[PDB]
């Protein structure tokens, strides 16, 4: 198998919270605030 997070597809938009690349900004922007809400990842 493989290891590490590496691939082919870099976007001009990156999340300053989870470091997740996106296609459009609109999505990213909302993806930033949305982080807090949808019961999922443990804030910590």
Residues facing residue 14 across a β-bridge: 21
**Coil, strand or helix at 39:** coil
Q: Does 14 bind Zn ion (CB under 5 A)?
A: no
22 touches Zn ion (CB under 5 A): no
Measure the CA–CA gap between 24 and 44, rounded to whole angstroms: 28
Q: Which of 12, 14, 17, 21 binds Zn ion (CB under 5 A)?
A: 17
| Nearer to Zn ion among residue 13 and residue 20 (C-beta) | 20
Cα distance between residue 23 and residue 7, in whole Å: 15
- 2 versus 36: smaller Cβ distance to Zn ion: 36
The residues of the shown chain that bind Zn ion, judged by CB under 5 A, are 15, 17-18, 20
């Amino acid at each position: 198998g493989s290891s590490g997070s590496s691939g082919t597809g870099e976007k001009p938009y990156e999340c300053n919270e989870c470091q997740k690349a996106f296609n459009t900004k609109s999505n990213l922007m909302v993806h930033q605030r949305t982080h807090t809400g949808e019961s999922g990842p443990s804030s910590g």
